[PDB]
Amino acid sequence: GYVTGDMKELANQLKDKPVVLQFIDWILRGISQVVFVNNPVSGILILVGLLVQNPWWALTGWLGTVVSTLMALLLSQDRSLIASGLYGYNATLVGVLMAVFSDKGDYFWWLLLPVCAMSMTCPIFSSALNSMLSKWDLPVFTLPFNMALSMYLSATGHYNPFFPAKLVIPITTAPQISWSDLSALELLKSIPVGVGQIYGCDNPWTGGIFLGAILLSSPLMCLHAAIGSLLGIAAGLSLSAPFEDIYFGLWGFNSSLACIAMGGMFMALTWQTHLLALGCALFTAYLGVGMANFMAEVGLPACTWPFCLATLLFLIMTTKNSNIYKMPLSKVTYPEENRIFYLQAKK
Amino acid sequence: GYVTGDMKELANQLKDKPVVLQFIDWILRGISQVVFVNNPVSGILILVGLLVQNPWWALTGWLGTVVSTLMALLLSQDRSLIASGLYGYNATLVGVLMAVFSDKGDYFWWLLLPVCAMSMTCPIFSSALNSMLSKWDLPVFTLPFNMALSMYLSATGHYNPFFPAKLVIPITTAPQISWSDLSALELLKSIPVGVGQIYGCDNPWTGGIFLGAILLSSPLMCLHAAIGSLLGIAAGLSLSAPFEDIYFGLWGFNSSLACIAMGGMFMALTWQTHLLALGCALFTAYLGVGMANFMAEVGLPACTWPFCLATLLFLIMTTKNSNIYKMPLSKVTYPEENRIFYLQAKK
Amino acid sequence: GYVTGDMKELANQLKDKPVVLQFIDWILRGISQVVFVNNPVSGILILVGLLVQNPWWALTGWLGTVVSTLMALLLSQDRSLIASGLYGYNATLVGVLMAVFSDKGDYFWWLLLPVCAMSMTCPIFSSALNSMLSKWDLPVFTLPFNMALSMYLSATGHYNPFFPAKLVIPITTAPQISWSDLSALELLKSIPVGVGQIYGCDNPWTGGIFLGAILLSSPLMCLHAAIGSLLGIAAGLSLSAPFEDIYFGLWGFNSSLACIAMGGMFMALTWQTHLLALGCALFTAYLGVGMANFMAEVGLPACTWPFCLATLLFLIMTTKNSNIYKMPLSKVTYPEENRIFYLQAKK
Numbered sequence A, B, C: 001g002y003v004t005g006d007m008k009e010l011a012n013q014l015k016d017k018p019v020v021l022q023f024i025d026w027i028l029r030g031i032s033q034v035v036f037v038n039n040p041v042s043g044i045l046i047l048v049g050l051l052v053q054n055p056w057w058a059l060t061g062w063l064g065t066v067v068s069t070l071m072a073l074l075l076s077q078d079r080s081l082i083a084s085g086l087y088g089y090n091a092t093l094v095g096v097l098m099a100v101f102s103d104k105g106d107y108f109w110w111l112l113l114p115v116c117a118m119s120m121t122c123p124i125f126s127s128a129l130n131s132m133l134s135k136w137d138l139p140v141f142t143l144p145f146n147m148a149l150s151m152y153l154s155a156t157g158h159y160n161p162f163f164p165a166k167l168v169i170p171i172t173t174a175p176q177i178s179w180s181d182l183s184a185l186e187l188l189k190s191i192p193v194g195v196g197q198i199y200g201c202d203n204p205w206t207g208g209i210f211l212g213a214i215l216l217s218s219p220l221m222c223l224h225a226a227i228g229s230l231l232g233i234a235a236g237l238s239l240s241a242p243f244e245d246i247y248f249g250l251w252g253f254n255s256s257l258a259c260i261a262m263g264g265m266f267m268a269l270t271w272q273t274h275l276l277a278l279g280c281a282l283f284t285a286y287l288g289v290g291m292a293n294f295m296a297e298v299g300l301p302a303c304t305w306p307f308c309l310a311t312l313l314f315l316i317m318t319t320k321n322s323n324i325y326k327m328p329l330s331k332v333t334y335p336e337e338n339r340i341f342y343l344q345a346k347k
């Protein structure tokens, strides 16, 4: 009970502690905030999962988070946002995916130089988008990370002498799918892989650890992540996608995030909003394959562009339904507290 | 006189009728609203023209409109907008152009499955765009349809095992144009074809029927549609476009819409605004060829992206001219009533 | 002292002169406003530099500026903006770069026809963006020019029978860089070339003349332009860019503009804002190579898209630092007056 939720008691106790422990807590919260989790223990679990997948990726992500938090402190950003990990969760993804999309293999120490540089731009993006989106009461999601990674991967490319990137080839021929070779076990295993591919990790154990951390933060968030991954798998099956792409979790890491965001987190949790979150996850998977095909023509991966776009689209949409409630941005903590607040406001 | 204009008397009489007749009226108005027409009889005429061109395309468009209206009703959207056909006119285009850009020929019944799915997203897009564009008092035009069709055609592509799309090849060699083979009769005939290509129909009879329906709704709108198609033809001739592209109406279906919108419809009709509409039609044709060339590099058709972009750009532009008047979004019915309202407000 | 700054005395004396002299002054100010300079004498110097580089390019730019100013007068835009050259500085770039990116060589008189047409659309863009951006207190920069040039170059392309454009080939193989062949003299000479490539001119004498004109307007702006060009060169060296691209000034014409804008011009000049301008110049160079690589896949040059995007991103970003001050849009004249106003407001 002490480690569940956002761990407000730990933050209150650390508010008067030496700044080193506070900085460590901020780094852990920023690591956890990729899946909309404000738990430092969930951040430790996510770090353990990243180390299980690849220690080099974990090192790059931790370095990116540290550099982003330090730069946000240097830029005199809001201290409340920095304490909650909202300044540094984009750079974790930036560093991890820069290590993922590198063509020079593991432990390429020179890659530590661009990573920091891009981690130097994550706060600025996070600032510049926020002051706009907070005008319309909308979150930035992973838009700063998407912009930074697209800019970096366009600047370097596959043929960069210093930091070559993994080549992205657009689909040229019609795939041949043997539907008799579809494996139910692999389809079931792609759900943890789908959840784990949020950090670009294809290890089923890493995805299971991520799901466990999310469940530690909030069981409803873990359930919505699993359902979003399953819906991404279903959308991939509906479009006759290659089985290797479905088994790799490339179809479920956007829909899982969309289901987490639209289910309980930024909309009050009701069965109507549950169905809306399911529909948003399906739409997010379809937009994900569309964006992947579109940016494959320019040599870029879609990453989490479809998730941000679809979630913003569904959040901006307005309905004359009292049971479909959009939570205020200042009261969004986690689905249980969000539902309690919505029930209190309803009466 | 009873069937001209928006047919407000029919709506008033149907407001207390059984909901089946009201739903039929809403579907007809949504069909007609592609060309900014709120006339159910014009919707019937447009359906007849679509059947003349291709019954399969008409069936897909009708199914898309019905599904979009039902989904907008399910989402508790504004009943006034649904009654006027503003929730369902984008899905008509979505279904018709999904049938048009299909590589599996006519009467591919499986294509009825994705169409409905895309018609499920047309209301949401509209809503998500409306709440964004109503702040600055701007219409959504066919932006939801453009976004939905771009996402669908990127997701499927030409090499999809289930729903392949027609291949789009960027221009590779310089065209050889024999200017002695230019036909005045074909140039004149491309005006109805350019008007009918709004629905993706290249039949001159279909375009003539569409022009007749628009004239039934409003003569000024039909005149502006014809002038916009002619201006698109002129712009195509100015850039040495292939004659087959001009004869197919691919150059005049965006400028015609731009001239309809900017002439009398969303700006008060004056000779100054008439010249502004002509300039907007020329700019829209040039932006149309530019956007088509740009999106051919990613394997996508431009469709009505240039029309929406150019019309929004011309509507946002502000001048210190009293005779260049932008009609309020709540008072926009059709050019005759718009001009009457503008004359009343001027005095 | 009479010709330094904006020469408000000359404007006051010309306010009651015949309109021909006023129009000439407006054209000169519009020519100079590309580098955020409101000096007609600097406009004359920039015209001299353009003539030194290429008389055809100077003729096209002058014609574009004249046409844009004439149509902005015809469109009843704000007279104060027209008098300060803010309606016509985008068409100077449009005409000059349309002459630059033409595949038909120099003195192609038919190119005078599209140029005017694009100069026709420059005021509208300048209007349409302004009303959108003045809400958030942001400048339009060269966004109208970028939009117009992208639209034109997409519409025509390399294979246009009438107005072919220079082919843009994306990078296909990894460059081989002989670092022992790097020349310090060429690196130093690329700074004036980097400043002169704002107008698409690769002549070092032209860049030196441009720097002299900027220094005549304001020494701080010239210093920031030189530092931005140097930072662009450094960023190009950091990414192992080909030496020919660095020597051609293709790496420094965006960072120089970003350093001019962010240093003293649109943000109050302090050492903190000086470091922020340096960081913005580095970010602008990296975004410039990224966007160049991105639009090379669609056959388009990036031009000044990265400069506008990065400068807007850095201007929107908000910090809780009193020394990092964003000047109001109505009081922005030049860095010396900007700093004086900021110092007066601080106390």
Ligand SMILES: CCCCCCCCCCCCCCCC(=O)O
Pocket: A110, A113, A114, A117, A118, A151, A152, A155, A156, A162, A163, C238, C239, C286, C287, C290
């Ligand atoms: C936006 C893309 C670029 C981001 C910033 C990249 C900065 C890299 C660090 C500069 C020096 C790198 C030297 C590496 C030499 C080598 O790889 O052998």
Ligand SMILES: CCCCCCCCCCCCCCCC(=O)O
Pocket: A128, A147, A148, A150, A151, A154, C290, C291, C294, C309, C310, C312, C313, C316
């Ligand atoms: C795909 C290659 C390009 C690089 C990736 C996109 C980088 C975008 C940087 C600028 C973001 C927008 C800044 C604010 C603009 C506005 O005024 O709305």
Ligand SMILES: CCCCCCCCCCCCCCCC(=O)O
Pocket: A179, A234, A235, A237, A238, A282, B117
């Ligand atoms: C809106 C879509 C909802 C999800 C639909 C999931 C459908 C999964 C199965 C679709 C393809 C079934 C196999 C057909 C191919 C074959 O067996 O030859």
Ligand SMILES: CCCCCCCCCCCCCCCC(=O)O
Pocket: A272, A273, A275, A276, A279, A280, A282, A283, A286, B074, B075, B117, B118, B120, B121
């Ligand atoms: C892209 C294909 C899938 C698109 C799915 C769009 C539909 C999402 C929302 C589903 C309906 C939710 C209705 C909730 C209110 C109610 O049930 O009364």
Ligand SMILES: CCCCCCCCCCCCCCCC(=O)O
Pocket: A287, A290, A291, A294, A309, A310, A312, A313, B147, B148, B150, B151, B154
């Ligand atoms: C070409 C790639 C596929 C097609 C993608 C079309 C766009 C679909 C999603 C649009 C979401 C728009 C959200 C806007 C949010 C905002 O204005 O901040």
Ligand SMILES: CCCCCCCCCCCCCCCC(=O)O
Pocket: A238, A239, A286, A287, A290, B110, B113, B114, B117, B118, B151, B152, B155, B156, B162, B163
């Ligand atoms: C955004 C692109 C996708 C839009 C939604 C597509 C949903 C298709 C329906 C799912 C089942 C398809 C079965 C096809 C069977 C076949 O063609 O053999």
Ligand SMILES: CCCCCCCCCCCCCCCC(=O)O
Pocket: B179, B234, B235, B237, B238, B239, B282, C117
């Ligand atoms: C902005 C201008 C719009 C109107 C343009 C009208 C058409 C002019 C170009 C078409 C005629 C070209 C004739 C020369 C062809 C040739 O003989 O090679």
Ligand SMILES: CCCCCCCCCCCCCCCC(=O)O
Pocket: B272, B273, B275, B276, B279, B280, B282, B283, B286, C074, C075, C117, C118, C120, C121
């Ligand atoms: C790219 C093709 C050229 C586009 C040029 C658009 C010009 C718009 C037309 C403006 C005409 C004048 C408007 C009324 C002013 C007046 O004459 O009193």
Ligand SMILES: CCCCCCCCCCCCCCCC(=O)O
Pocket: B238, B239, B286, B287, C110, C113, C114, C117, C118, C151, C152, C155, C156, C162, C163
């Ligand atoms: C955005 C597209 C281009 C802008 C508009 C270009 C208008 C050109 C009008 C004149 C066309 C005919 C003159 C060229 C004749 C020739 O070169 O043979």
Ligand SMILES: CCCCCCCCCCCCCCCC(=O)O
Pocket: B290, B291, B294, B309, B310, B312, B313, C147, C148, C150, C151, C154
């Ligand atoms: C590659 C060809 C196209 C180049 C860019 C041309 C863009 C013309 C229209 C710009 C958008 C104007 C409307 C903006 C509306 C809004 O954002 O609210």
Ligand SMILES: CCCCCCCCCCCCCCCC(=O)O
Pocket: A117, C179, C234, C235, C237, C238, C282
């Ligand atoms: C993040 C901004 C960095 C700006 C300064 C970067 C300076 C880079 C200097 C060149 C890098 C090394 C070149 C030689 C490498 C070799 O010989 O292989």
Ligand SMILES: CCCCCCCCCCCCCCCC(=O)O
Pocket: A074, A075, A117, A118, A120, A121, C272, C275, C276, C278, C279, C280, C282, C283, C286
């Ligand atoms: C793309 C790589 C480079 C990115 C550079 C980002 C950092 C810009 C410079 C920020 C300096 C901040 C100075 C004010 C704070 C202070 O020192 O008091």
